[PDB]
Amino acid sequence: ATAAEIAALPRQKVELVDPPFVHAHSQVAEGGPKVVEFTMVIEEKKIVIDDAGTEVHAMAFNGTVPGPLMVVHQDDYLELTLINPETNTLMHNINFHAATGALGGGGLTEINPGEKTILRFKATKPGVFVYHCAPPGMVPWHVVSGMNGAIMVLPREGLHDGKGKALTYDKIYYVGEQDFYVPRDENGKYKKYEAPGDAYEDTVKVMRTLTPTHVVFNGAVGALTGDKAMTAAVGEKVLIVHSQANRDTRPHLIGGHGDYVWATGKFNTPPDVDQETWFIPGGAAGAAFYTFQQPGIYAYVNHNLIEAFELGAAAHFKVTGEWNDDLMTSVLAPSG
Amino acid sequence: ATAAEIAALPRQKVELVDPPFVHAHSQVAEGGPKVVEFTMVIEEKKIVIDDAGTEVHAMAFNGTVPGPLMVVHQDDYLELTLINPETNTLMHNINFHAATGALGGGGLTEINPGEKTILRFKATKPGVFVYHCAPPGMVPWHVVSGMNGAIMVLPREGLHDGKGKALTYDKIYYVGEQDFYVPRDENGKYKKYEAPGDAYEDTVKVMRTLTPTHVVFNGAVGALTGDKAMTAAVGEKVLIVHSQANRDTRPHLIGGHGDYVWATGKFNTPPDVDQETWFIPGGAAGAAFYTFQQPGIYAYVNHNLIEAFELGAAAHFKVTGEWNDDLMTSVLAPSG
Amino acid sequence: ATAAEIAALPRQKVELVDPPFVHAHSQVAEGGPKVVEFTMVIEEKKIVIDDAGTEVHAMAFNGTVPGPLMVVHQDDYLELTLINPETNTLMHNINFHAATGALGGGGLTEINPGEKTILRFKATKPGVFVYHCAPPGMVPWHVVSGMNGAIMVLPREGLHDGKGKALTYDKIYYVGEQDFYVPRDENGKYKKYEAPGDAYEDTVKVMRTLTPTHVVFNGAVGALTGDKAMTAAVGEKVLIVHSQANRDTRPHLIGGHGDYVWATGKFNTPPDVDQETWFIPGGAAGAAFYTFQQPGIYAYVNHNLIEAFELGAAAHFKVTGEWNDDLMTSVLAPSG
Ligand SMILES: O=N[O-]
Ligand SMILES: O=N[O-]
Ligand SMILES: O=N[O-]
Ligand SMILES: [Cu+2]
Ligand SMILES: [Cu+2]
Ligand SMILES: [Cu+2]
Ligand SMILES: [Cu+2]
Numbered sequence A, B, C: 001a002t003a004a005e006i007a008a009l010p011r012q013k014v015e016l017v018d019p020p021f022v023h024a025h026s027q028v029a030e031g032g033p034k035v036v037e038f039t040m041v042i043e044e045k046k047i048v049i050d051d052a053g054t055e056v057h058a059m060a061f062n063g064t065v066p067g068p069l070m071v072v073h074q075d076d077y078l079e080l081t082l083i084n085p086e087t088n089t090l091m092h093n094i095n096f097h098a099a100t101g102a103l104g105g106g107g108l109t110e111i112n113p114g115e116k117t118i119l120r121f122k123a124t125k126p127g128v129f130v131y132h133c134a135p136p137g138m139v140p141w142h143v144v145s146g147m148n149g150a151i152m153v154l155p156r157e158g159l160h161d162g163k164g165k166a167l168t169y170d171k172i173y174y175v176g177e178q179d180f181y182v183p184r185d186e187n188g189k190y191k192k193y194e195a196p197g198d199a200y201e202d203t204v205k206v207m208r209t210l211t212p213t214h215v216v217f218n219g220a221v222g223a224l225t226g227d228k229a230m231t232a233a234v235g236e237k238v239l240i241v242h243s244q245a246n247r248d249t250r251p252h253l254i255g256g257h258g259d260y261v262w263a264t265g266k267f268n269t270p271p272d273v274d275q276e277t278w279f280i281p282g283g284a285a286g287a288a289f290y291t292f293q294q295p296g297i298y299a300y301v302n303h304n305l306i307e308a309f310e311l312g313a314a315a316h317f318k319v320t321g322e323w324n325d326d327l328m329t330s331v332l333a334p335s336g
């Protein structure tokens, strides 16, 4: 496509929504190729990641951890206006694993506080992909400070299983998993810092142990529980998009399954089926499609149970509906 | 199926056998759907896991670590009678990754010492699946104390390769891999405790490092080596079911391969072929099919060689038969 | 084939080249089955792995880390002459994951300093496979000292996608990833030893932590950058073979993708497509096929960014050619 043909394409401005929600979109593409426009302001901010009050000097796209999920269709163009407010102190940029060239866009988006840039790339490959900041000299630090998210490039024809049959979800949720490495003092207590820079040296030491102090969904322990628990109903089809820009994870829906799982996150790669626990490597996004068959509370976790229950990697799904005794029933309740 | 149709289904009691062995079963289903009945008594007991007398207060389904392998066919019902003797001191339950609803059955099987419960679930998805105890608030602890196992839900038509060609094994083994986190004193000696709960705090501290002190098969270092090595003969087709309820593993048959490997452990997902080393994520089970071609001793290991030879993740296969010089031969034996 | 039939097969002597380059070969088999001959001399030498002068007493096949990549075709016979110089002090052998029998050849190739041996095996399974030393009693040690490599067993008819379409690469590179566990003194400084055996004890304690001090490509930090960066040009098809003999890895081409990826490294297992980041379990090799579309410098890393940018797992690709504004363009360059 020439610059003229591209400039002639229709454009649609999209308003991003905070994770785990996803902005309105059409599973099946509307018309031909479009230039989808997104805008994100980078915010360096202090966030609390657990009930104890542990602090992290986050570097958040659109002000959230993970950054929001941008959705486009294959062969559409994603035009991102990225802003780094003069209130920030570090240089930032963005790298789309979905894009091709200049380190995923990182080599063309280096912006200092008080600057902005607009990047456009053709979404040539369908699937879910990770995106993260990557400043030459402190890549891992920025990413484990929460500066990452994901995008979804849907086939123009929507989703299908490995045999041509359509897969249409009723709901979609984006679970961004984050590994945090918070310094501790001699008492084993998490340390606090005045500015993000102050924590760098101590943090790097923790990072080198390759042992995160916290592994959380949506920026904090329990962030997707209670009133923030995700929801569904028996019969409802749900697509759960999951990303981890730095460390491996192994998603598992307790009480359920991944009926169709694109574990590698790429739609032209047939999804695995009837999965109990799938695997997403650090630096990637994956997606699972499931039709709920039983009501009740479900937990969605990274299945290294220590990471799930001791480190923070557990979310909840509240599901309404009629219980199915054929699928499961208590013949004899706990009794003497 | 109607209420009457389900109640009319044949009920069959099956006696379990200890791992790595598997109870008698047929690969191709014999007759229509059945309600297969199993009973397991829970045992809390101290076990030694290495040659240094290191102890673990194990929580074992049916008295073994891993728990035994239950085998049923797709659409059969698995009805488990779970017993927690008055001699035990902890609460227990069971979570079947193969089941649908109530956290895999955990929310319906919480039993205190002196109680029993009967759970029935329809095995709707074919594959090998992990099962483990999962008491709200103490999941990882009981799981890494050995309270986990697996089940195999065979297709009613038996196993087949990605092309539809049947795969019939002559024998089957179940290797359950366990990550243990044993506390050590300031001198580096593993500590001993009077009761399970006494070790809780120290153990959780070790668990948080995400670094197991031991990684073993069948509950102890060397449990499947020497005189307890598994066996086979040249020409024999063997299915090796492998599980890890909490941590990733990478099985490898030294000297052999995984001719067909359902790495995700699910039969409707085509198996990978000619595998050197496969990957099973924590929270799942997988299965490898291999036809032995050469006689001799083979080592079956988790291929992070430190976990295999330093931590204990190594088993052996003793194979009888005639050597094949076409496949391999020493043209010049070691010499000056 | 009988002994006589094999002895009648044509032989071909191959000259090995140092990684990341691969010795001359043909993608499509040039003629019928033959006995491909290779010779490697084991070199026990000191190598500096980082810019801090950190040393490792390496055990290297053919004098390099990783060992060179041997290329044959399915059903050819690989005849390796392994030599252990009198100048060496340790016992060595070789285990081919691609071979069938005697622990992959390790039980037939044990050679003391001043000895040699000739092993011949039939490459019956197509794909990339790991090969490494495995001295009963100290396995993990030699392997994590750099004594491992890989070989490639191409289909007779060359490479194909999942649908049978031919995949012909213009260039091929072999990246051997290595996890090192270097002991430190009480000041956190890496220690040096005058003899290999001298570091054994100290090394074993670091290995127990399952936390490498270094994770590198081709034996050292920055080894595959600058004067050793891999090259290509827009439109060129490149196959990137990657192996890890002891620990998991998740390769990612920054700015690009893995158009076709045999993640398990086995050719009869259909490759995944449009990959952002793939996964290779410790004890295996994988291969990715990509056609560069953009010029510029690309980074190739193990996508646990701490491992890549802090521990050393990073390589570079220098690509010449013209920039493609359709795929990516900076609508608005960084500005006020
Ligand atoms: O099934 N996860 O506890
Ligand atoms: O070749 N097995 O370590
Ligand atoms: O997108 N590679 O860091
Ligand atoms: Cu940034
Ligand atoms: Cu950054
Ligand atoms: Cu990245
Ligand atoms: Cu229990």
Ligand SMILES: [Cu+2]
Pocket: B059, B091, B092, B093, B133, B134, B135, B142, B143, B147
């Ligand atoms: Cu329990």
Ligand SMILES: [Cu+2]
Pocket: A252, B095, B097, B132, B283
């Ligand atoms: Cu579970």
Ligand SMILES: [Cu+2]
Pocket: C059, C091, C092, C093, C133, C134, C135, C142, C147
């Ligand atoms: Cu050696």
Ligand SMILES: [Cu+2]
Pocket: C091, C092, C093, C133, C134, C135, C138, C139, C142, C143, C147
């Ligand atoms: Cu060795």
Ligand SMILES: [Cu+2]
Pocket: B252, C095, C097, C132, C283
């Ligand atoms: Cu090996």
